[PDB]
């Protein structure tokens, strides 16, 4: 624990907080270390707004100088956070707009009120099996029985995914996310979920159904997507769909059990759920760390410079705390706080998440469910006690020990 002018970032999540606040005070730009592998890290807010708005940083991995000389390769162990098939993802300029748009116009709140019914079902289902499960006064893991399926199910029914295959894709992600996965088994959960979603395109398109991936195949608008590009998306669109709102749910429910008196303001109405919801993805959402841009050519900021063919990851979690921006308890959760929904917690520019819409819906429906479900739900564990699994970019906790209450 001596200086280090390179911050190495963690594994095994020892301690979040810890550099979480260390990335604050050494930013908004500055150079971390991820498994052996140099890059940049933004986290401070107006810098991180300029930057995914700036041209001259691209998602292409082919842009990346190390991955030219070729030393970094596919044994890193997070290579398939980038290095992945032609999507909305992977893409820059007037081609990604192209890639977007059926899913943009899929998931516009609007066309979401058709999907809302279907969410209601997934969260009284779900909440059955809490009830069945916390029967007696059993301690029970909310993630496993309650938040973990409940998003899966939801993007499943999106994208048109079978009810009996959901089960593997989870198994297969928990693999892909953890660090501890070794990495020939990892490339090759990497190619089996390849496999699986290159099939479910090609039924798809011998019968298309009232799904998102159909509208991805055939198109109104009207030239058609490739297949690399449709199944590129479709997968994208489960992983995100899936890996991020479980978290958030898990995040709200611990702020608001560890902050009981707000948990009551949006009980009683006094603030709304969604607001709840917004200080929860600033102060502790499903993103650490966003991998990864890289820059076409030199990029001059001042006072600083980055080189051209240099990696620059967006530290998400770092840029919610940001102390200029949400003031000097930005530590703090505190969903009266007036920059509450002033986060760009899912991102900012082109690659704005196009599903921000259905992630603040399943959260707003399944939130309130859940506490008038059961209004003396409580931990089984002091709530700080709750590790996080080694999963480097993504905010994933491990366990949540409940009582249903009473
Ligand atoms: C709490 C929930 C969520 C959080 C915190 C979140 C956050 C993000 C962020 C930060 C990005 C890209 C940011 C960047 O490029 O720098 C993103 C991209 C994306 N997200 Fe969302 N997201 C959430 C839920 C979802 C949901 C529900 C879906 C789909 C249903 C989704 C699908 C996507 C896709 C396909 C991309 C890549 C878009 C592109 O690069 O153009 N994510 N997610
Ligand atoms: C990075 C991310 C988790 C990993 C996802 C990424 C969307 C694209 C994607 C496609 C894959 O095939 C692997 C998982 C990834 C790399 C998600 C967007 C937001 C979320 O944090
Ligand atoms: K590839
Ligand atoms: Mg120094």
Same mark, same amino acid.
């Given at each position: 624990?001596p200086h280090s002018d390179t911050l190495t970032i963690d594994p095994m999540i020892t301690d979040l907080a810890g550099e979480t606040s260390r990335l604050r005070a050494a930013g908004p730009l500055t150079r971390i270390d991820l498994l052996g592998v140099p890059a940049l890290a933004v986290t401070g807010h107006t810098l991180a707004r300029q930057l995914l708005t700036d041209t001259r940083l691209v998602k292409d991995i082919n842009a990346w100088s190390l991955w030219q000389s070729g030393t970094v390769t596919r044994q890193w162990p997070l290579i398939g956070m980038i290095d992945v098939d032609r999507s909305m993802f992977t893409?820059?300029?007037?081609?990604?707009?192209?890639?977007?748009?059926?899913?943009?116009?899929?998931?516009?709140?609007?066309?979401?009120?058709?999907?809302?019914?279907?969410? *209601?079902?997934?969260?009284?289902?779900?909440?059955?099996?809490? *009830?069945?499960?916390? $029967?007696?006064?059993?301690?029970?893991?909310?993630?496993?029985?309650?938040?973990?399926?409940?998003?899966?199910?939801?993007?499943?029914?999106?994208?048109?995914?079978?009810? *009996?295959?959901?089960?593997?894709?989870?198994?297969?992600?928990?693999?892909?996310?953890?660090?501890?996965?070794?990495?020939?088994?990892?490339?090759?959960?990497?190619?089996?979920?390849?496999?699986?979603?290159?099939?479910?395109?090609?039924?798809?398109?011998?019968?298309?159904?009232?799904?998102?991936?159909?509208?991805?195949?055939? $198109?109104?608008?009207?030239?058609?997507?490739?297949?690399? #590009?449709?199944?590129?998306?479709?997968?994208?669109?489960? $992983?995100?769909?899936? #890996?991020?709102?479980?978290?958030?749910?898990?995040?709200?429910?611990?702020?608001?059990?560890?902050?009981?008196?707000?948990?009551?303001?949006?009980?009683?109405?006094?603030?709304?759920?969604?607001?709840?919801?917004?200080?929860?993805?600033?102060?502790?959402?499903?993103?650490?760390?966003?991998?990864?841009?890289?820059?076409? *050519?030199?990029?001059?900021?001042?006072?600083?410079?980055?080189?051209?063919? #240099?990696?620059?990851?967006?530290?998400?979690?770092?840029?919610?705390?940001?102390?200029?921006?949400?003031?000097?308890? $930005?530590?703090?959760?505190?969903?009266?706080?007036?920059?509450?929904?002033?986060?760009?917690?899912?991102?900012?520019?082109?690659?704005?998440?196009?599903?921000?819409?259905?992630?603040?819906?399943?959260?707003?429906?399944?939130?309130?469910?859940?506490?008038?479900?059961?209004?003396?739900?409580?931990?089984?564990?002091?709530?700080?006690?709750?590790?996080?699994?080694?999963?480097?970019?993504?905010?994933?906790?491990?366990?949540?020990?409940?009582?249903?209450?009473?």
């Amino acid at each position: 624990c001596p200086h280090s002018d390179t911050l190495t970032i963690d594994p095994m999540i020892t301690d979040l907080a810890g550099e979480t606040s260390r990335l604050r005070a050494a930013g908004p730009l500055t150079r971390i270390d991820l498994l052996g592998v140099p890059a940049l890290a933004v986290t401070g807010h107006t810098l991180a707004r300029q930057l995914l708005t700036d041209t001259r940083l691209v998602k292409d991995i082919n842009a990346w100088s190390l991955w030219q000389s070729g030393t970094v390769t596919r044994q890193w162990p997070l290579i398939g956070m980038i290095d992945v098939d032609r999507s909305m993802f992977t893409v820059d300029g007037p081609e990604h707009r192209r890639l977007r748009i059926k899913t943009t116009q899929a998931l516009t709140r609007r066309r979401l009120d058709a999907l809302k019914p279907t969410i *209601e079902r997934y969260v009284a289902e779900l909440l059955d099996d809490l *009830e069945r499960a916390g $029967a007696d006064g059993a301690v029970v893991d909310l993630k496993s029985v309650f938040a973990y399926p409940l998003p899966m199910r939801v993007i499943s029914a999106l994208m048109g995914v079978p009810s *009996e295959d959901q089960e593997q894709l989870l198994t297969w992600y928990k693999a892909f996310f953890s660090i501890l996965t070794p990495q020939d088994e990892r490339l090759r959960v990497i190619d089996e979920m390849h496999g699986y979603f290159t099939e479910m395109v090609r039924r798809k398109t011998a019968e298309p159904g009232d799904d998102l991936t159909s509208a991805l195949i055939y $198109a109104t608008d009207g030239t058609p997507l490739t297949e690399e #590009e449709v199944i590129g998306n479709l997968q994208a669109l489960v $992983a995100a769909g899936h #890996e991020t709102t479980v978290s958030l749910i898990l995040t709200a429910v611990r702020a608001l059990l560890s902050h009981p008196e707000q948990l009551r303001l949006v009980r009683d109405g006094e603030i709304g759920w969604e607001t709840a919801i917004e200080e929860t993805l600033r102060w502790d959402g499903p993103v650490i760390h966003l991998l990864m841009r890289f820059a076409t *050519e030199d990029i001059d900021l001042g006072d600083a410079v980055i080189p051209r063919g #240099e990696g620059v990851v967006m530290s998400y979690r770092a840029i919610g705390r940001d102390i200029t921006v949400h003031g000097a308890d $930005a530590d703090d959760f505190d969903i009266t706080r007036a920059t509450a929904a002033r986060h760009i917690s899912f991102g900012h520019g082109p690659h704005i998440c196009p599903g921000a819409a259905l992630a603040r819906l399943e959260a707003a429906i399944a939130l309130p469910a859940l506490f008038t479900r059961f209004p003396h739900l409580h931990p089984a564990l002091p709530l700080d006690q709750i590790p996080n699994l080694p999963v480097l970019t993504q905010n994933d906790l491990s366990h949540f020990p409940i009582h249903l209450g009473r």
